[PDB]
Amino acid sequence: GPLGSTPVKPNYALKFTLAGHTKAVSSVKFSPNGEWLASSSADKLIKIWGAYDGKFEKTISGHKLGISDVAWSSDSNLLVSASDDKTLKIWDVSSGKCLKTLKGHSNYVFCCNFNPQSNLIVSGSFDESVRIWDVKTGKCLKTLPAHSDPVSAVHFNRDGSLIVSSSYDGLCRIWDTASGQCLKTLIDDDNPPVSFVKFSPNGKYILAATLDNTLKLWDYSKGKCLKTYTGHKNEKYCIFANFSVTGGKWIVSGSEDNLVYIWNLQTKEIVQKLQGHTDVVISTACHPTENIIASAALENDKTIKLWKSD
Protein backbone atom coordinates (compact mmCIF):
# COMPACT_ATOMS: atom_id res chain seq x y z
CA GLY A 1 0.00 0.00 0.00
CA PRO A 2 0.84 3.78 0.47
CA LEU A 3 4.18 3.29 2.29
CA GLY A 4 7.06 1.91 0.28
CA SER A 5 7.46 -1.84 -0.22
CA THR A 6 10.86 -1.02 1.25
CA PRO A 7 9.63 1.55 3.86
CA VAL A 8 11.77 2.64 6.80
CA LYS A 9 9.25 1.25 9.30
CA PRO A 10 5.63 0.15 8.88
CA ASN A 11 2.62 1.41 10.88
CA TYR A 12 0.65 -1.69 11.79
CA ALA A 13 -2.45 -0.76 13.75
CA LEU A 14 -5.12 -2.69 15.58
CA LYS A 15 -8.31 -3.18 13.59
CA PHE A 16 -9.98 -6.12 15.34
CA THR A 17 -9.87 -8.29 18.44
CA LEU A 18 -11.51 -11.70 18.12
CA ALA A 19 -12.91 -13.56 21.09
CA GLY A 20 -14.51 -16.96 21.45
CA HIS A 21 -11.92 -19.43 22.56
CA THR A 22 -12.50 -20.24 26.21
CA LYS A 23 -8.83 -21.05 26.71
CA ALA A 24 -5.32 -20.19 25.51
CA VAL A 25 -4.93 -19.81 21.77
CA SER A 26 -2.10 -21.91 20.34
CA SER A 27 -1.82 -20.84 16.72
CA VAL A 28 -3.41 -18.84 13.94
CA LYS A 29 -3.13 -19.34 10.19
CA PHE A 30 -4.47 -17.37 7.25
CA SER A 31 -5.96 -19.52 4.45
CA PRO A 32 -3.82 -19.52 1.29
CA ASN A 33 -6.58 -17.69 -0.60
CA GLY A 34 -6.49 -15.02 2.10
CA GLU A 35 -10.21 -15.20 2.92
CA TRP A 36 -10.04 -16.87 6.32
CA LEU A 37 -8.14 -17.25 9.56
CA ALA A 38 -8.11 -20.45 11.56
CA SER A 39 -7.19 -20.70 15.23
CA SER A 40 -6.50 -23.70 17.45
CA SER A 41 -6.84 -23.56 21.22
CA ALA A 42 -6.35 -25.44 24.48
CA ASP A 43 -10.15 -25.47 24.59
CA LYS A 44 -10.03 -28.38 22.09
CA LEU A 45 -11.52 -26.25 19.30
CA ILE A 46 -10.73 -24.66 15.95
CA LYS A 47 -12.38 -21.45 14.83
CA ILE A 48 -12.64 -19.80 11.43
CA TRP A 49 -12.78 -16.01 11.06
CA GLY A 50 -13.01 -13.67 8.10
CA ALA A 51 -9.53 -12.45 7.26
CA TYR A 52 -10.51 -8.82 6.60
CA ASP A 53 -13.50 -8.08 8.87
CA GLY A 54 -12.55 -10.38 11.74
CA LYS A 55 -16.10 -11.78 11.78
CA PHE A 56 -16.54 -15.19 13.44
CA GLU A 57 -17.47 -17.94 10.98
CA LYS A 58 -17.65 -21.46 12.40
CA THR A 59 -16.37 -23.77 15.14
CA ILE A 60 -14.83 -27.04 13.92
CA SER A 61 -14.48 -29.60 16.74
CA GLY A 62 -13.77 -33.23 17.59
CA HIS A 63 -10.43 -33.41 19.38
CA LYS A 64 -10.46 -35.04 22.81
CA LEU A 65 -7.71 -32.89 24.32
CA GLY A 66 -5.83 -29.71 23.46
CA ILE A 67 -4.78 -28.69 19.95
CA SER A 68 -1.25 -27.23 19.72
CA ASP A 69 -1.25 -26.56 15.98
CA VAL A 70 -3.48 -26.18 12.92
CA ALA A 71 -2.49 -25.75 9.26
CA TRP A 72 -4.12 -25.20 5.84
CA SER A 73 -3.70 -27.05 2.53
CA SER A 74 -2.89 -25.15 -0.69
CA ASP A 75 -6.44 -25.09 -2.06
CA SER A 76 -7.50 -23.60 1.26
CA ASN A 77 -9.94 -26.54 1.45
CA LEU A 78 -8.50 -28.60 4.30
CA LEU A 79 -7.01 -28.25 7.75
CA VAL A 80 -4.80 -30.52 9.79
CA SER A 81 -4.38 -30.21 13.55
CA ALA A 82 -2.01 -31.55 16.21
CA SER A 83 -3.69 -32.51 19.48
CA ASP A 84 -2.70 -33.75 22.93
CA ASP A 85 -5.07 -36.65 22.40
CA LYS A 86 -2.07 -38.09 20.55
CA THR A 87 -3.66 -37.60 17.14
CA LEU A 88 -3.88 -35.42 14.07
CA LYS A 89 -7.15 -34.82 12.26
CA ILE A 90 -7.87 -33.87 8.67
CA TRP A 91 -10.76 -31.39 8.36
CA ASP A 92 -13.06 -30.32 5.57
CA VAL A 93 -13.15 -26.58 6.27
CA SER A 94 -16.26 -26.44 4.13
CA SER A 95 -18.36 -28.97 6.06
CA GLY A 96 -16.51 -28.53 9.36
CA LYS A 97 -16.56 -32.33 9.54
CA CYS A 98 -13.62 -34.59 10.34
CA LEU A 99 -12.41 -36.57 7.32
CA LYS A 100 -9.50 -38.50 8.86
CA THR A 101 -7.97 -39.10 12.31
CA LEU A 102 -4.25 -39.86 11.96
CA LYS A 103 -3.22 -42.34 14.68
CA GLY A 104 0.40 -43.29 15.33
CA HIS A 105 2.23 -40.97 17.73
CA SER A 106 2.58 -42.17 21.32
CA ASN A 107 2.55 -38.74 22.93
CA TYR A 108 1.25 -35.24 22.23
CA VAL A 109 1.37 -34.07 18.60
CA PHE A 110 2.93 -30.62 18.79
CA CYS A 111 3.14 -29.48 15.18
CA CYS A 112 1.81 -30.35 11.70
CA ASN A 113 1.83 -29.17 8.05
CA PHE A 114 0.67 -30.10 4.53
CA ASN A 115 3.17 -30.26 1.66
CA PRO A 116 2.45 -27.89 -1.24
CA GLN A 117 0.82 -30.67 -3.28
CA SER A 118 -1.39 -31.31 -0.24
CA ASN A 119 -1.14 -35.10 -0.57
CA LEU A 120 1.12 -35.39 2.44
CA ILE A 121 1.08 -34.33 6.09
CA VAL A 122 4.24 -33.89 8.16
CA SER A 123 3.82 -34.10 11.93
CA GLY A 124 5.97 -33.48 14.97
CA SER A 125 5.30 -35.11 18.31
CA PHE A 126 6.50 -35.25 21.91
CA ASP A 127 7.60 -38.83 21.23
CA GLU A 128 10.47 -37.22 19.30
CA SER A 129 9.57 -38.65 15.93
CA VAL A 130 8.52 -36.95 12.71
CA ARG A 131 5.82 -38.70 10.70
CA ILE A 132 4.81 -38.29 7.06
CA TRP A 133 1.17 -39.06 6.34
CA ASP A 134 -0.96 -39.81 3.30
CA VAL A 135 -3.85 -37.34 3.25
CA LYS A 136 -6.12 -39.61 1.15
CA THR A 137 -5.47 -42.97 2.83
CA GLY A 138 -5.02 -41.39 6.26
CA LYS A 139 -2.18 -43.85 6.79
CA CYS A 140 1.35 -43.14 7.97
CA LEU A 141 4.07 -43.40 5.29
CA LYS A 142 7.18 -43.00 7.47
CA THR A 143 8.35 -42.64 11.05
CA LEU A 144 11.58 -40.68 11.07
CA PRO A 145 13.46 -41.12 14.35
CA ALA A 146 14.13 -37.38 13.96
CA HIS A 147 15.27 -36.23 17.40
CA SER A 148 15.97 -37.19 21.01
CA ASP A 149 13.54 -34.79 22.65
CA PRO A 150 10.16 -33.41 21.65
CA VAL A 151 9.84 -32.07 18.08
CA SER A 152 8.63 -28.43 18.05
CA ALA A 153 8.16 -27.81 14.30
CA VAL A 154 7.78 -29.48 10.87
CA HIS A 155 7.74 -27.72 7.49
CA PHE A 156 7.96 -28.57 3.73
CA ASN A 157 9.80 -26.48 1.10
CA ARG A 158 8.19 -24.94 -2.06
CA ASP A 159 8.00 -28.32 -3.78
CA GLY A 160 7.61 -30.54 -0.77
CA SER A 161 10.83 -32.35 -1.55
CA LEU A 162 12.36 -31.42 1.83
CA ILE A 163 11.17 -31.36 5.44
CA VAL A 164 12.74 -29.17 8.10
CA SER A 165 12.28 -30.01 11.77
CA SER A 166 13.17 -28.52 15.15
CA SER A 167 13.46 -29.94 18.65
CA TYR A 168 14.24 -29.16 22.30
CA ASP A 169 17.21 -31.39 21.60
CA GLY A 170 18.78 -28.16 20.27
CA LEU A 171 18.79 -29.48 16.72
CA CYS A 172 17.45 -28.45 13.31
CA ARG A 173 17.09 -31.12 10.65
CA ILE A 174 16.42 -31.36 6.93
CA TRP A 175 14.85 -34.53 5.59
CA ASP A 176 14.43 -35.92 2.11
CA THR A 177 10.67 -36.54 1.94
CA ALA A 178 11.11 -39.34 -0.60
CA SER A 179 13.72 -41.43 1.26
CA GLY A 180 13.19 -40.09 4.75
CA GLN A 181 16.97 -39.78 5.00
CA CYS A 182 18.47 -37.06 7.24
CA LEU A 183 20.19 -34.67 4.81
CA LYS A 184 21.51 -31.97 7.09
CA THR A 185 21.81 -30.95 10.73
CA LEU A 186 21.96 -27.30 11.78
CA ILE A 187 23.83 -27.19 15.07
CA ASP A 188 25.07 -24.71 17.74
CA ASP A 189 27.88 -24.79 20.36
CA ASP A 190 25.36 -24.02 23.13
CA ASN A 191 22.45 -26.14 21.95
CA PRO A 192 19.52 -24.10 23.27
CA PRO A 193 16.20 -25.84 22.61
CA VAL A 194 14.87 -25.07 19.15
CA SER A 195 11.27 -23.92 19.59
CA PHE A 196 10.52 -23.03 15.95
CA VAL A 197 11.74 -23.47 12.38
CA LYS A 198 10.42 -22.84 8.87
CA PHE A 199 11.66 -22.65 5.28
CA SER A 200 11.79 -19.19 3.67
CA PRO A 201 9.40 -18.54 0.77
CA ASN A 202 12.11 -19.23 -1.81
CA GLY A 203 13.43 -22.31 -0.01
CA LYS A 204 17.02 -21.14 0.33
CA TYR A 205 16.80 -20.26 4.01
CA ILE A 206 15.49 -21.58 7.31
CA LEU A 207 14.08 -19.28 9.99
CA ALA A 208 14.62 -20.80 13.41
CA ALA A 209 13.67 -19.88 16.97
CA THR A 210 15.66 -20.89 20.09
CA LEU A 211 14.57 -20.50 23.69
CA ASP A 212 17.33 -17.99 24.39
CA ASN A 213 15.29 -15.01 23.17
CA THR A 214 16.74 -15.43 19.69
CA LEU A 215 15.63 -15.87 16.08
CA LYS A 216 17.99 -17.04 13.36
CA LEU A 217 18.08 -16.94 9.57
CA TRP A 218 20.02 -19.88 8.12
CA ASP A 219 21.39 -20.61 4.64
CA TYR A 220 20.76 -24.35 4.80
CA SER A 221 22.69 -25.37 1.71
CA LYS A 222 25.79 -23.86 3.33
CA GLY A 223 24.60 -24.61 6.85
CA LYS A 224 25.54 -21.12 7.99
CA CYS A 225 23.72 -18.59 10.17
CA LEU A 226 23.14 -15.38 8.18
CA LYS A 227 21.05 -13.26 10.54
CA THR A 228 20.35 -13.08 14.25
CA TYR A 229 17.21 -11.24 15.42
CA THR A 230 16.89 -10.24 19.06
CA GLY A 231 15.33 -7.85 21.53
CA HIS A 232 12.33 -9.91 22.56
CA LYS A 233 11.46 -12.47 25.21
CA ASN A 234 11.27 -16.17 24.37
CA GLU A 235 12.54 -18.71 26.88
CA LYS A 236 9.43 -20.73 27.68
CA TYR A 237 7.02 -21.20 24.77
CA CYS A 238 7.12 -22.19 21.14
CA ILE A 239 6.29 -18.93 19.40
CA PHE A 240 5.83 -19.21 15.60
CA ALA A 241 7.82 -16.69 13.55
CA ASN A 242 6.88 -15.33 10.09
CA PHE A 243 8.32 -13.84 6.89
CA SER A 244 6.50 -10.66 5.88
CA VAL A 245 6.69 -9.78 2.19
CA THR A 246 3.48 -8.07 0.96
CA GLY A 247 4.65 -4.66 2.15
CA GLY A 248 8.24 -4.49 3.33
CA LYS A 249 10.43 -7.52 4.09
CA TRP A 250 10.12 -8.31 7.77
CA ILE A 251 10.51 -11.19 10.20
CA VAL A 252 7.54 -11.22 12.56
CA SER A 253 7.12 -12.92 15.91
CA GLY A 254 5.05 -12.98 19.06
CA SER A 255 6.82 -12.55 22.39
CA GLU A 256 6.58 -13.27 26.10
CA ASP A 257 6.36 -9.61 27.06
CA ASN A 258 2.88 -9.58 25.45
CA LEU A 259 4.09 -7.70 22.38
CA VAL A 260 4.48 -8.51 18.69
CA TYR A 261 7.86 -7.73 17.18
CA ILE A 262 8.57 -6.80 13.57
CA TRP A 263 12.19 -6.75 12.37
CA ASN A 264 13.86 -5.62 9.15
CA LEU A 265 15.06 -8.85 7.53
CA GLN A 266 18.31 -7.34 6.25
CA THR A 267 19.28 -4.98 9.10
CA LYS A 268 17.93 -7.10 11.94
CA GLU A 269 16.69 -3.87 13.52
CA ILE A 270 13.28 -3.94 15.19
CA VAL A 271 11.00 -1.68 13.16
CA GLN A 272 7.79 -2.01 15.15
CA LYS A 273 6.29 -3.59 18.29
CA LEU A 274 2.54 -4.17 18.42
CA GLN A 275 1.02 -3.46 21.84
CA GLY A 276 -2.40 -4.73 22.85
CA HIS A 277 -2.28 -8.25 24.25
CA THR A 278 -2.28 -8.84 27.98
CA ASP A 279 -0.38 -12.12 27.94
CA VAL A 280 2.32 -13.90 25.93
CA VAL A 281 1.78 -13.74 22.17
CA ILE A 282 2.27 -17.37 21.17
CA SER A 283 1.32 -17.14 17.51
CA THR A 284 1.44 -14.58 14.71
CA ALA A 285 0.60 -14.94 11.04
CA CYS A 286 1.12 -12.73 8.03
CA HIS A 287 -1.65 -12.27 5.45
CA PRO A 288 -0.81 -13.78 2.01
CA THR A 289 -1.56 -10.64 -0.05
CA GLU A 290 -2.44 -7.68 2.20
CA ASN A 291 -0.40 -6.26 5.07
CA ILE A 292 -2.38 -8.01 7.81
CA ILE A 293 -0.85 -9.69 10.87
CA ALA A 294 -2.76 -12.08 13.17
CA SER A 295 -1.56 -12.52 16.76
CA ALA A 296 -2.92 -14.89 19.40
CA ALA A 297 -2.36 -14.80 23.18
CA LEU A 298 -2.33 -17.34 26.04
CA GLU A 299 -5.09 -18.25 28.61
CA ASN A 300 -4.40 -15.11 30.56
CA ASP A 301 -5.60 -13.12 27.53
CA LYS A 302 -7.46 -15.58 25.23
CA THR A 303 -7.87 -13.28 22.21
CA ILE A 304 -6.77 -12.83 18.62
CA LYS A 305 -5.97 -9.41 17.18
CA LEU A 306 -5.74 -8.30 13.55
CA TRP A 307 -3.40 -5.47 12.65
CA LYS A 308 -3.36 -3.70 9.25
CA SER A 309 -0.58 -1.55 7.83
CA ASP A 310 0.12 0.60 4.80
Binding site: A24, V25, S26, A42, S68
Partner: peptide, 5 residues
Protein backbone atom coordinates in the same frame (compact mmCIF):
# COMPACT_ATOMS: atom_id res chain seq x y z
CA UNK B 1 -0.03 -28.44 24.53
CA UNK B 2 1.94 -25.55 23.03
CA UNK B 3 0.17 -23.39 25.60
CA UNK B 4 1.93 -25.05 28.56
CA UNK B 5 5.62 -24.70 29.56
Amino acid sequence: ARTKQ
